Design a protein around this ligand. Structure first.
Ligand SMILES: [K+]
Ligand SMILES: [K+]
Ligand SMILES: [K+]
Ligand SMILES: [K+]
Ligand SMILES: [K+]
Ligand SMILES: [K+]
Ligand SMILES: [K+]
Ligand SMILES: [K+]
Ligand SMILES: [K+]
Ligand SMILES: [K+]
Ligand SMILES: [K+]
Ligand SMILES: [K+]
Ligand SMILES: [K+]
Ligand SMILES: [K+]
Ligand SMILES: [K+]
Ligand SMILES: [K+]
Ligand SMILES: [K+]
Ligand SMILES: [K+]
Ligand SMILES: [K+]
Ligand SMILES: [K+]
Ligand SMILES: [K+]
Ligand SMILES: [K+]
Ligand SMILES: [K+]
Ligand SMILES: [Mg+2]
Ligand SMILES: [Mg+2]
Ligand SMILES: [Mg+2]
Ligand SMILES: [Mg+2]
Ligand SMILES: [Mg+2]
Ligand SMILES: [Mg+2]
Ligand SMILES: [Mg+2]
Ligand SMILES: [Mg+2]
Ligand SMILES: [Mg+2]
Ligand SMILES: [Mg+2]
Ligand SMILES: [Mg+2]
Ligand SMILES: [Mg+2]
Ligand SMILES: [Mg+2]
Ligand SMILES: [Mg+2]
Ligand SMILES: [Mg+2]
Ligand SMILES: [Mg+2]
Ligand SMILES: [Mg+2]
Ligand SMILES: [Mg+2]
Ligand SMILES: [Mg+2]
Ligand SMILES: [Mg+2]
Ligand SMILES: [Mg+2]
Ligand SMILES: [Mg+2]
Ligand SMILES: [Mg+2]
Ligand SMILES: [Mg+2]
Ligand SMILES: [Mg+2]
Ligand SMILES: [Mg+2]
Ligand SMILES: [Mg+2]
Ligand SMILES: [Mg+2]
Ligand SMILES: [Mg+2]
Ligand SMILES: [Mg+2]
Ligand SMILES: [Mg+2]
Ligand SMILES: [Mg+2]
Ligand SMILES: [Mg+2]
Ligand SMILES: [Mg+2]
Ligand SMILES: [Mg+2]
Ligand SMILES: [Mg+2]
Ligand SMILES: [Mg+2]
Ligand SMILES: [Mg+2]
Ligand SMILES: [Mg+2]
Ligand SMILES: [Mg+2]
Ligand SMILES: [Mg+2]
Ligand SMILES: [Mg+2]
Ligand SMILES: [Mg+2]
Ligand SMILES: [Mg+2]
Ligand SMILES: [Mg+2]
Ligand SMILES: [Mg+2]
Ligand SMILES: [Mg+2]
Ligand SMILES: [Mg+2]
Ligand SMILES: [Mg+2]
Ligand SMILES: [Mg+2]
Ligand SMILES: [Mg+2]
Ligand SMILES: [Mg+2]
Ligand SMILES: [Mg+2]
Ligand SMILES: [Mg+2]
Ligand SMILES: [Mg+2]
Ligand SMILES: [Mg+2]
Ligand SMILES: [Mg+2]
Ligand SMILES: [Mg+2]
Ligand SMILES: [Mg+2]
Ligand SMILES: [Mg+2]
Ligand SMILES: [Mg+2]
Ligand SMILES: [Zn+2]
Lengths: 138, 99, 208, 104, 124, 83
RNA sequence: AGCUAGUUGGUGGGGUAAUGGCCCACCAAGGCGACGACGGGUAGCCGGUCUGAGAGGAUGGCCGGCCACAGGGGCACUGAGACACGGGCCCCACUCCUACGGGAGGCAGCAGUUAGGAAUCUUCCGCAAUGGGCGCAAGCCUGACGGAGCGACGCCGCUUGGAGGAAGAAGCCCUUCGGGGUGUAAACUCCUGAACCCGGGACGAAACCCCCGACGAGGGGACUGACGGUACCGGGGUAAUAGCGCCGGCCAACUCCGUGCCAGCAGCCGCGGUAAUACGGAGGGCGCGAGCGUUACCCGGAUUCACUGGGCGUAAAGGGCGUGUAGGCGGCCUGGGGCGUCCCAUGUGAAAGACCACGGCUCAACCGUGGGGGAGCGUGGGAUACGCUCAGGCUAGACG
RNA sequence: UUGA
RNA sequence: UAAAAC
């Protein structure tokens, strides 16, 4: 058993991209799927899709990267130079709308889970609501 | 030395005595009444009970008891009295107690 | 209060020309002209590479010494400038520049700042017709700075205000050489002033 | 408004008085983690109406005694010693914490 | 530590021990001299540093350095202690205030005078 | 009894009072119940005396007793004019 | 690390303005504690204050709010109110009177004395102003207060001069002995004119009161200033206090002589044993300036107790291992609830302070006015993603 | 032996 | 060799 599926996911991703994988499977849950959408729309990953491995539901997550590069070490840049978990079991982090942070002066996002669904710090700010600060990506 | 308002003391001692005396009477009569009732002697148990009521209310006219202090006493009195009587019966003189 | 001592030695230390004397500072009789090198028994030896600190110091010393203001008053002004909205550097200068003892100097009633200071003290100056003998008094926009009538006929105010005929006056100021009165038009913009000083360094000195 | 609290009756060895265990949750002031603290209230029960295991509402009342400043508003949920258990046990572990002896 | 841990034990605040039990943390303490010895420097020094055992008002007895070229402190000299150790003589953690009470200022001192209690010499 | 009086707030030689409603027993510069005006005895500005007439009238309506000086100022501001 | 007998609860009383083991009979045998009881130590709490980028740390003097105390202990009387600082009773310690039986007293009110201490003021003026008590009022009382006095203790403003002056006096200091420095600094020339001397001279004070009117609204009139002959205005008018720390690195400022592990310096690293920019003096220089240094103490730098924001193979740090209690934490789907969480409205968040703005003292310090802030908590309404809870389902964890 |  | 010491 995973103690925190959401962190598990952000990591599977963190790890998959650090070795330039093409996709990466993660056990499914609506909530996880919901975050992937934000992740897609913001253009961090190419997208994802429901699949079945060994007969159990997963979520292929097609990752994205920059272009090849010059000089020593041609490995591309990462679209996801960062992806950390904020709230964690046994230390949840909740914020008010005036308390939603601004990741990298806006060049990054923060996915919150509010009583109006899962949204980015901009979306959440817009609808004028706060919630559980899930993670920040940039 | 000599703060002429020693007069306040001088007076408190009088008022003290004046009160102490009014209450001493209230108590004695209250008992007398409670005792008479406790023996079924309704006729006079109330007779005396009324003096007590009257004495109490008068004491409340000035600083002696004044207030709900009186109320409390009249209450606890008629309460004890009516009861000790209704343990033999016959509320004769029907002094202070109603119906 | 105020320095009160050899002022040319200050020019020589900052290596730049400061005008703590008005005339003479223009004449080749100036000390910055004769021996343009630090005062003292070592002013002529090779100056060692100054430390980042020395630089910020010397720079700020320069600016402050230009107005003859005390490190005390000089600092309080800077802290006031910091708090206010707007580029601290600019605001600071506008403030140092709004000092009556200085405005009187800008309007040529005096040849130097140290002189304009004494003019203010000895009541020879006026603000909106009311007397003011506070060198630190802060002139606001619209205020009119004049000369006490009782003073208008002074052997000194003659030359100074006379020699002011046909002379230009800073963009933020207007001078009426006849009525012996000028007007503080607006707070000097950083670019209006041309001081041999880099405020960034100053802002950074008080940063430390 | 008179404060109202909800808890479990963890004792009723007292005449017309039951011990209600109320819990609360709050963000630790510096560390944020939601922590759960709890307190026991001696509520007034004039009819010996409530029993061990009863979850009830307690309401700020006028003093009934030193210590008693609450009355049982109403029964929220009948029997459930699962809660009473935690308590008894947590208190039972106290034995094994001195210089004497108890249980593991 | 985990958060649960910090929630349970929390961090412990750093306490600070004094270098000057001049008691009441008082800036200065008055005392009377016992001895007026001399001491040997340690580590890599050599000289006859002038110390003084002092019985303070604060019910204390401690050694205190006598700064300056030379003093006039006998046995029962009334002195003022000010605190400031002396890297060389372990045990000496205070200084006598030249210029206060029985300890006379320093003579012929023309520079760092406020320290060493020396009035300004007239000149003309 | 409650009162409508002056509370000194200026500074040395620079007195500025506050017309206040405070309990009679309180120190003067102490905790008042309500400010209902102010007064600059040296009338150093065009506005050296303001009074919330509606409010003053309210307190007077419930017992508040003005100082003889506060009564004077309250009058000057038309608290008692009934034309 | 266990605590508890009025102890926890009950019935009936007593008591108070009033609830209540507050107190008393009688009855039950309870109550409290690792979510830290009991004990020990220390301490009046708060608005705020200092510091910090913040989070936080430290703090509670002045001012405002609450509490407690009035030589120490206890008690009640009087009264709307007290268990009463300048009221009462008793015990105690002390001081004073004593014809020895016995009495008198309590500055943690203002001022002052003495003691202790490194250290903290005038036995001042006034009741004019504000406020308070009593009085129908005149008025009386008010060491509350408004003022002055002393102390650079702090903050702010101000002066010890301004302009001209030698390819540059003398003196003093270095020197390649040519000269370099102090330095336009000085003397000088001219100008202004703090101090001081005359003249004028204040706001703060219009009420209470009297008259008219109705003892009201309204109107009219009179008295009253401690600060003070002070502030300030005008006239005249002298060129007239500068000190303190530092100059080896950190750290801005360097040379000669003296001294020779000595005398001494020293915040840390360190410096002095013959040529020391580090000891002492001198010339020169840097910093700051009616102050400048020192000591002590708080925060900072210190992400060095790390929530923001740290670590544990060899640096300090994994428990010798297991079993397991409490606690902490919890896979996937659906539904109810709506505690956590989030949202709107509302109440509260005093004044002062802090922030912004305008304004009053010539400025400022200081002060007045106005505006904007605000976490937390109460109330009403709403949201339901996540956490929690209840109910049902699943098989990917676990177990068989 | 000390110190550098 | 400056000293401690011989
Ligand atoms: K009487
Ligand atoms: K003009
Ligand atoms: K036990
Ligand atoms: K009324
Ligand atoms: K009872
Ligand atoms: K304790
Ligand atoms: K602050
Ligand atoms: K923070
Ligand atoms: K605190
Ligand atoms: K505190
Ligand atoms: K605090
Ligand atoms: K009238
Ligand atoms: K004059
Ligand atoms: K002169
Ligand atoms: K020599
Ligand atoms: K040497
Ligand atoms: K030297
Ligand atoms: K030296
Ligand atoms: K520190
Ligand atoms: K070990
Ligand atoms: K062990
Ligand atoms: K609220
Ligand atoms: K739900
Ligand atoms: Mg009798
Ligand atoms: Mg009465
Ligand atoms: Mg003149
Ligand atoms: Mg029971
Ligand atoms: Mg509770
Ligand atoms: Mg040595
Ligand atoms: Mg020290
Ligand atoms: Mg009126
Ligand atoms: Mg027991
Ligand atoms: Mg009862
Ligand atoms: Mg009762
Ligand atoms: Mg009890
Ligand atoms: Mg304790
Ligand atoms: Mg204490
Ligand atoms: Mg910090
Ligand atoms: Mg700050
Ligand atoms: Mg803070
Ligand atoms: Mg206070
Ligand atoms: Mg005493
Ligand atoms: Mg009474
Ligand atoms: Mg009394
Ligand atoms: Mg007294
Ligand atoms: Mg003494
Ligand atoms: Mg008076
Ligand atoms: Mg009065
Ligand atoms: Mg000379
Ligand atoms: Mg000159
Ligand atoms: Mg003249
Ligand atoms: Mg009068
Ligand atoms: Mg008449
Ligand atoms: Mg009449
Ligand atoms: Mg009138
Ligand atoms: Mg240097
Ligand atoms: Mg020699
Ligand atoms: Mg020697
Ligand atoms: Mg030195
Ligand atoms: Mg030498
Ligand atoms: Mg040096
Ligand atoms: Mg040095
Ligand atoms: Mg810093
Ligand atoms: Mg820290
Ligand atoms: Mg570490
Ligand atoms: Mg080892
Ligand atoms: Mg190790
Ligand atoms: Mg091991
Ligand atoms: Mg468990
Ligand atoms: Mg779950
Ligand atoms: Mg759980
Ligand atoms: Mg659903
Ligand atoms: Mg649910
Ligand atoms: Mg809720
Ligand atoms: Mg609110
Ligand atoms: Mg406020
Ligand atoms: Mg102004
Ligand atoms: Mg305000
Ligand atoms: Mg808010
Ligand atoms: Mg609400
Ligand atoms: Mg609500
Ligand atoms: Mg719902
Ligand atoms: Mg289930
Ligand atoms: Mg098994
Ligand atoms: Zn020049």
């Amino acid at each position: 058993m995973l103690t925190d599926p959401i962190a598990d996911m952000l990591t599977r991703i963190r790890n998959a991209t650090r070795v330039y994988k093409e996709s990466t499977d993660v056990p499914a849950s609506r909530f996880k799927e919901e975050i992937l959408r934000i992740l897609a729309r913001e253009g961090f990953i190419k997208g994802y899709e429901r699949v079945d491995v060994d007969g159990k539901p997963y979520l292929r997550v097609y990752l994205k990267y920059g272009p090849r590069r010059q000089g020593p070490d041609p490995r591309p840049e990462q679209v996801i130079h960062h992806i950390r978990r904020i709230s964690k079991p046994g230390r949840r982090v909740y914020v008010g709308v005036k308390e939603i942070p601004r990741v990298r002066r806006g060049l990054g996002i923060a996915i919150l889970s509010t009583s109006k669904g899962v949204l980015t710090d901009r979306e959440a700010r817009k609808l004028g609501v706060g919630g559980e600060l899930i993670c920040e990506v940039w | 030395r000599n703060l002429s308002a020693l007069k306040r003391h001088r007076q408190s001692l009088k008022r003290r005595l004046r009160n102490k005396a009014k209450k001493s009477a209230i108590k004695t009569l209250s008992k007398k009444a409670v005792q008479l009732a406790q023996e079924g002697k309704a006729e006079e148990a109330l007779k005396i009970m009324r003096k007590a009521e009257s004495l109490i209310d008068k004491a409340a006219k000035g600083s002696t008891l004044h207030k709900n202090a009186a109320a409390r006493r009249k209450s606890r009195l008629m309460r004890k009295v009516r009861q000790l009587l209704e343990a033999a019966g016959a509320p004769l003189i029907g002094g202070g107690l109603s119906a | 209060g105020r320095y009160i001592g050899p002022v040319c030695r200050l020019c020589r230390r900052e290596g730049v020309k400061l005008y703590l004397k008005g005339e003479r500072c223009y004449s080749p009789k100036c000390a910055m002209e004769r021996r343009p090198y630090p005062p003292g028994q070592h002013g002529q030896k090779r100056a060692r590479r100054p430390s980042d600190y020395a630089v910020r110091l010397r720079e700020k010393q320069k600016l402050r010494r230009i107005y003859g203001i005390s490190e005390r008053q000089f600092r309080n002004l800077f802290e006031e400038a910091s708090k206010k909205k707007g580029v601290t550097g600019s605001v600071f200068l506008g403030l140092l520049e709004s000092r009556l003892d200085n405005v009187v100097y800008r309007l040529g009633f005096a040849v130097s700042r140290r002189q304009a200071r004494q003019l203010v003290r000895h009541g020879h100056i006026t603000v909106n017709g009311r007397r003011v003998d506070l060198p630190s008094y802060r002139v606001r926009p619209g205020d009119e700075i004049a000369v006490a009538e009782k003073s208008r006929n002074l052997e000194l105010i003659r030359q100074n205000l006379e020699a002011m005929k046909g002379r230009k006056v800073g963009p933020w100021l207007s001078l009426d050489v006849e009525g012996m009165k000028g007007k503080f038009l607006r707070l000097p913009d950083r670019e209006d002033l041309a001081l041999p000083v880099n405020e960034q360094l100053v802002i950074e000195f008080y940063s430390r | 408004p008179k404060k109202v609290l909800t808890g479990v009756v963890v004792s009723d060895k007292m005449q017309k008085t039951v011990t209600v265990l109320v819990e609360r949750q709050f963000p630790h002031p510096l560390y944020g983690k939601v922590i759960k603290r709890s307190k026991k209230y001696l509520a007034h029960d004039p009819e010996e109406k409530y029993k061990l295991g009863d979850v009830v509402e307690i309401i700020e009342s006028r003093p009934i005694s030193k210590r008693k400043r609450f009355r049982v508003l109403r029964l929220v949920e009948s029997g459930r010693m699962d809660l009473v258990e935690k308590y008894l046990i947590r208190r039972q572990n106290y034995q094994s914490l001195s210089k004497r002896g108890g249980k593991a | 530590p985990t958060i649960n841990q910090l929630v349970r034990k929390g961090r412990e605040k750093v306490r600070k021990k004094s270098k000057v039990p001049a008691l009441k943390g008082a800036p200065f303490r008055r005392g009377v001299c016992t001895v007026v010895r001399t001491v040997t420097p340690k580590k890599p020094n050599s000289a006859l540093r002038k110390v003084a055992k002092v019985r303070l008002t604060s019910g204390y007895e401690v050694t205190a350095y006598i700064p300056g070229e030379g003093h006039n402190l006998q046995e029962h000299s009334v002195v003022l202690i000010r605190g400031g150790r002396v890297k060389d003589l372990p045990g000496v953690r205070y200084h006598i205030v030249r210029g206060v009470y029985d300890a006379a200022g320093v003579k012929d001192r023309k520079k760092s005078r406020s320290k060493y209690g020396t009035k300004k010499p007239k000149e003309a | 009894m409650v009162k409508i009086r002056l509370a000194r707030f200026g500074s040395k030689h620079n007195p500025h009072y506050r017309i206040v409603v405070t309990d009679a027993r309180r120190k003067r510069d102490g905790k008042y119940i309500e400010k209902i005006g102010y007064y600059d005895p040296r009338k150093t500005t065009p506005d050296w005396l303001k009074v919330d007439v509606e409010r003053a009238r309210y307190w007077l309506s419930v017992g508040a007793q003005p100082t003889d000086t506060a009564r004077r100022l309250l009058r000057q501001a038309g608290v008692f004019r009934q034309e």
